[PDB]
Design a protein around this motif. Structure first.
Motif, PDB file in Angstrom:
ATOM      1  N   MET A   9      88.953 102.763  57.931  1.00 50.78           N
ATOM      2  CA  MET A   9      87.722 101.875  58.714  1.00 50.78           C
ATOM      3  C   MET A   9      88.265 100.507  58.874  1.00 50.78           C
ATOM      4  SD  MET A   9      83.877 101.390  58.154  1.00 50.78           S
ATOM      5  CE  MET A   9      83.618 103.296  58.459  1.00 50.78           C
ATOM      6  N   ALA A  10      89.080  99.983  58.430  1.00 56.47           N
ATOM      7  CA  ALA A  10      89.866  98.952  58.325  1.00 56.47           C
ATOM      8  C   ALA A  10      90.918  98.912  59.497  1.00 56.47           C
ATOM      9  CB  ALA A  10      90.717  98.385  57.229  1.00 56.47           C
ATOM     10  N   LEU A  11      91.695 100.212  59.585  1.00 50.96           N
ATOM     11  CA  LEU A  11      92.463 100.494  60.856  1.00 50.96           C
ATOM     12  C   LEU A  11      91.550 100.525  62.223  1.00 50.96           C
ATOM     13  CD1 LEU A  11      95.224 102.754  59.691  1.00 50.96           C
ATOM     14  CD2 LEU A  11      95.267 100.417  59.894  1.00 50.96           C
ATOM     15  N   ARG A  12      90.567 101.109  62.051  1.00 54.74           N
ATOM     16  CA  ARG A  12      89.517 101.089  63.122  1.00 54.74           C
ATOM     17  C   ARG A  12      89.236  99.833  63.683  1.00 54.74           C
ATOM     18  NH1 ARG A  12      86.955 106.228  60.702  1.00 54.74           N
ATOM     19  NH2 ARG A  12      88.194 108.068  61.609  1.00 54.74           N
ATOM     20  N   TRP A  13      88.822  98.837  62.703  1.00 57.29           N
ATOM     21  CA  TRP A  13      88.677  97.436  63.015  1.00 57.29           C
ATOM     22  C   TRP A  13      89.802  96.715  63.776  1.00 57.29           C
ATOM     23  CZ3 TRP A  13      89.989  92.653  62.739  1.00 57.29           C
ATOM     24  CH2 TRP A  13      89.180  91.795  62.727  1.00 57.29           C
ATOM     25  N   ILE A  14      90.924  96.910  63.116  1.00 53.32           N
ATOM     26  CA  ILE A  14      92.105  96.261  63.487  1.00 53.32           C
ATOM     27  C   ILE A  14      92.450  96.656  65.028  1.00 53.32           C
ATOM     28  CG2 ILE A  14      94.557  96.145  63.193  1.00 53.32           C
ATOM     29  CD1 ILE A  14      94.105  96.179  60.149  1.00 53.32           C
ATOM     30  N   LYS A  15      92.394  97.975  65.286  1.00 52.20           N
ATOM     31  CA  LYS A  15      92.434  98.361  66.625  1.00 52.20           C
ATOM     32  C   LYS A  15      91.415  97.758  67.677  1.00 52.20           C
ATOM     33  CE  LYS A  15      94.400 101.629  68.954  1.00 52.20           C
ATOM     34  NZ  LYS A  15      95.412 101.600  69.997  1.00 52.20           N
ATOM     35  N   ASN A  16      90.150  97.562  67.212  1.00 47.10           N
ATOM     36  CA  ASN A  16      89.222  97.245  68.232  1.00 47.10           C
ATOM     37  C   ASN A  16      89.227  95.702  68.255  1.00 47.10           C
ATOM     38  OD1 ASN A  16      88.676  99.893  68.564  1.00 47.10           O
ATOM     39  ND2 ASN A  16      86.836  99.720  67.143  1.00 47.10           N
ATOM     40  N   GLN A  57      92.030 111.304  60.713  1.00 44.55           N
ATOM     41  CA  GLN A  57      90.966 110.222  61.122  1.00 44.55           C
ATOM     42  C   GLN A  57      91.680 109.233  61.909  1.00 44.55           C
ATOM     43  OE1 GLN A  57      88.042 110.864  60.780  1.00 44.55           O
ATOM     44  NE2 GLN A  57      87.596 112.188  58.939  1.00 44.55           N
ATOM     45  N   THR A  58      93.055 108.781  61.765  1.00 50.83           N
ATOM     46  CA  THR A  58      93.474 107.777  62.258  1.00 50.83           C
ATOM     47  C   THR A  58      94.402 108.020  63.450  1.00 50.83           C
ATOM     48  OG1 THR A  58      95.255 108.107  60.816  1.00 50.83           O
ATOM     49  CG2 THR A  58      93.560 106.707  60.224  1.00 50.83           C
ATOM     50  N   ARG A  59      94.269 109.281  63.989  1.00 51.14           N
ATOM     51  CA  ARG A  59      95.303 109.605  65.210  1.00 51.14           C
ATOM     52  C   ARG A  59      95.327 108.796  66.152  1.00 51.14           C
ATOM     53  NH1 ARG A  59      97.876 114.741  67.476  1.00 51.14           N
ATOM     54  NH2 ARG A  59      97.463 115.830  65.419  1.00 51.14           N
ATOM     55  N   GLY A  60      96.348 108.104  66.373  1.00 52.57           N
ATOM     56  CA  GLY A  60      96.792 107.216  67.449  1.00 52.57           C
ATOM     57  C   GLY A  60      96.448 105.810  67.373  1.00 52.57           C
ATOM     58  N   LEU A  61      95.848 105.225  66.215  1.00 52.88           N
ATOM     59  CA  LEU A  61      95.433 104.006  65.886  1.00 52.88           C
ATOM     60  C   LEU A  61      96.707 102.925  65.743  1.00 52.88           C
ATOM     61  CD1 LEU A  61      92.362 104.007  65.676  1.00 52.88           C
ATOM     62  CD2 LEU A  61      92.649 104.535  63.391  1.00 52.88           C
ATOM     63  N   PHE A  62      97.955 103.382  65.478  1.00 51.43           N
ATOM     64  CA  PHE A  62      98.984 102.548  65.639  1.00 51.43           C
ATOM     65  C   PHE A  62     100.272 103.249  65.946  1.00 51.43           C
ATOM     66  CE2 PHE A  62     100.332 104.370  61.250  1.00 51.43           C
ATOM     67  CZ  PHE A  62      99.186 104.707  60.743  1.00 51.43           C
ATOM     68  N   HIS A  63     101.517 102.574  65.898  1.00 51.79           N
ATOM     69  CA  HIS A  63     102.674 103.085  66.638  1.00 51.79           C
ATOM     70  C   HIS A  63     103.874 103.053  65.702  1.00 51.79           C
ATOM     71  CE1 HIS A  63      99.489 101.022  68.817  1.00 51.79           C
ATOM     72  NE2 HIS A  63      99.412 102.095  69.773  1.00 51.79           N
ATOM     73  N   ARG A  64     103.994 102.194  64.602  1.00 49.45           N
ATOM     74  CA  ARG A  64     104.997 102.094  64.021  1.00 49.45           C
ATOM     75  C   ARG A  64     104.590 102.391  62.458  1.00 49.45           C
ATOM     76  NH1 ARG A  64     106.259 101.698  68.629  1.00 49.45           N
ATOM     77  NH2 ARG A  64     107.312  99.946  69.690  1.00 49.45           N
ATOM     78  N   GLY A  65     105.615 102.870  61.529  1.00 53.33           N
ATOM     79  CA  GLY A  65     105.127 102.851  60.075  1.00 53.33           C
ATOM     80  C   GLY A  65     106.481 102.475  59.164  1.00 53.33           C
TER      81      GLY A  65
END
Length: 566
Positions: free
Chosen positions: A189-196, A228-236
């Protein structure tokens, strides 16, 4: 932890509070979030740089009362301006310095930092997930200060998530809606927030990097594994950890009852009645008792944490781990984004402290049956096949007639870190679009600049690059001081933060604009590689074959007759 480090830390705590007031400015600023306006403050670093600081941004409802042990829900939006000029509290946890419980159930916040709120171009967004075995850790600036990273033109974000039994209680009964992995669902949910929302801070929503160390690495890997996080970020970036490490998951569905019993529960072992007690127990009682949950057999089988990420018993709306991590790698969207991975040169040196209390652990290397991967070993660790596997391990690390602590600490490096990394790379190769993974090896040793984990591992005056020794060169902490700019320590901060921001920007870690990297040809790992090549980071930067490779192949040979489980 000693009485000296308790009074010593007490003083640095008081010093950090005065320094933090001093390094604060009067320049407040307001930014938009999708939940409403937040007010941040500009702060100073000891290197005379400055940055905008937004702290205590909630990314979920406070998970108290009936939300306890439950998946997180979105927070309530507000009119007006929310004050984000101070940190919130950390997750409930045992303080490694004092031994007392600290923190609060109201812990689901993130912090945002950047030297420029209105850049002229959208910046790379870097998301740090702290480690701490899913049982300790925080995003406070006395431990994870943004001061080094804001020298670069990026947006840095430090998240928090539920720790311990409050983060990872798991119950079999489908009616109670406590499948487990609540703390991981926090991270989602934090990732979803960061994305938006990153765009409101100058960030590029299409260029987000997630990274973390130890448990933070496994978290990061989990964020790359789950649908759940598919496509949310681009590097790991996986620093000293991933999700198929033996400490990074556990089936803990039977341990809720035990925890309840330690906390004074009277009744039978059914989930419902167990849940109801745990729902009304004081949070700091549950956390103080987690240390007693594991049985002696489990400790014997090298189970490190009673509660943690787990295969969820049933699927729900916000399910994160429906299958064992090995099975999830076979489909993981994150296999197809640029990845960096690495370890330090003497990982197991972290366990100096533990050995000092249990010197009896060194004798485990007489047969090493205890370190055989659990999926291969038998219950009592006495089957002749297990003794055979133990022997292969023993040949890898026992240098002489009798095992030593150095042998022990060397084995741990591989059992907890190098072997899991190897298994993951080989698995990923069979299921990937062919996106590059780069490897590094952190080999820079210094006593002239340290971080708090060195107090816990009793790393005072101990040569070698232990697990967590690299954090010192990424983040400011209340044990740091200003280093001359020509020092080896300062150069390493520049290189380390240089490479990470370079990778975050382009999915490629090489830059000739980084000092020391002029002769470097950093190539990624191919499936056809029999030997891994990595950037060795010390006083000089140098591409080399991973020195741990022969020992890694020794561990792989335990799976000679069980290649399906590799």
């Amino acid at each position: 932890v000693s009485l000296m480090e308790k009074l010593k830390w007490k003083i640095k705590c008081i010093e950090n509070k005065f320094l933090n007031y001093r390094l604060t400015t009067n320049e407040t600023v307001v930014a938009e979030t999708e939940y409403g306006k937040v007010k941040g403050v500009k702060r100073l670093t000891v290197y005379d740089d400055s940055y905008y600081s937004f702290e205590g941004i909630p990314y979920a409802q406070p998970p108290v009362g009936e939300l306890r042990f439950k998946a997180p829900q979105r927070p309530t939006p507000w009119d007006g301006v929310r004050d984000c000029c101070n940190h919130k509290d950390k997750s409930v946890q045992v303080d490694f310095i004092t031994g007392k419980v600290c923190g609060s159930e109201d812990c689901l916040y993130l912090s945002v930092y950047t030297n420029n709120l209105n850049p002229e171009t959208k910046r790379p967004v870097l998301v740090y997930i702290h480690g701490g075995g899913f049982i300790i850790g925080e995003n406070h600036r006395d431990m994870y200060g943004p001061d080094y990273f804001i020298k670069k033109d990026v947006v840095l974000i430090n998240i928090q998530y539920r720790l311990g039994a409050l983060g990872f209680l798991s119950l079999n009964s489908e009616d109670l809606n406590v499948p487990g992995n609540a703390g991981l669902k926090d991270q989602v949910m934090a990732l979803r927030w960061i994305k938006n929302n990153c765009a409101n801070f100058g960030g590029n929503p299409d260029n987000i990097t997630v990274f973390g160390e130890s448990a933070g690495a496994a978290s990061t890997h989990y964020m790359m594994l789950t649908e759940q996080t598919r496509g949310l970020f681009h590097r790991g970036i996986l620093m000293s950890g991933n999700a198929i490490c033996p400490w990074a998951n556990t089936q803990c569905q039977h341990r809720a009852f035990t925890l309840a019993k330690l906390a004074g529960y009277k009744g039978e072992d059914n989930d419902k009645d167990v849940l109801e007690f745990l729902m009304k127990a004081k949070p700091q009682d549950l956390i103080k008792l987690e240390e007693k949950v594991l049985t002696l057999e489990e400790r014997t089988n090298k189970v490190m944490f009673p509660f943690g990420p787990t295969v969820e018993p049933y699927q729900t709306a916000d399910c994160v781990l429906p299958k064992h991590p090995r099975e999830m790698v076979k489909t993981a969207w994150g296999n197809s984004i640029p990845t960096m991975m690495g370890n330090t040169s003497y990982e197991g040196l972290f366990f100096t402290s533990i050995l000092k209390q249990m010197p009896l652990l060194v004798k485990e290397l007489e047969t090493c049956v205890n370190f055989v991967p659990s999926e291969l070993a038998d219950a009592e660790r006495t089957a002749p096949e297990t003794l055979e596997m133990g022997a292969k391990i023993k040949k890898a690390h026992v240098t002489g007639e009798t095992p030593t602590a150095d042998n022990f600490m060397d084995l741990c490096s591989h059992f907890y870190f190098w072997f899991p990394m190897h298994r993951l790379l080989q698995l990923r190769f069979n299921h990937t679009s062919g996106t590059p993974v780069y490897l590094y090896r952190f080999d820079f040793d210094s006593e002239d600049l340290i971080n708090p984990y060195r107090i816990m591992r009793s790393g005072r005056g101990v040569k070698g690059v232990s697990h967590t020794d690299e954090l010192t060169y990424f983040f400011w902490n209340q044990l740091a001081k200003r280093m001359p700019k020509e020092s080896r320590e300062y150069k390493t901060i520049e290189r380390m933060t240089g490479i990470w921001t370079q990778f975050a920007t382009t999915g490629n870690p090489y830059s000739n604009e980084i000092e020391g990297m002029e002769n470097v040809s950093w190539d990624p790992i191919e499936k056809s590689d029999e030997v891994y090549k990595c950037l060795n980071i010390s006083d000089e930067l140098k591409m080399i074959d991973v020195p741990e490779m022969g020992k890694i192949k020794q561990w792989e040979s335990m799976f000679e007759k069980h290649r399906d489980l590799f």
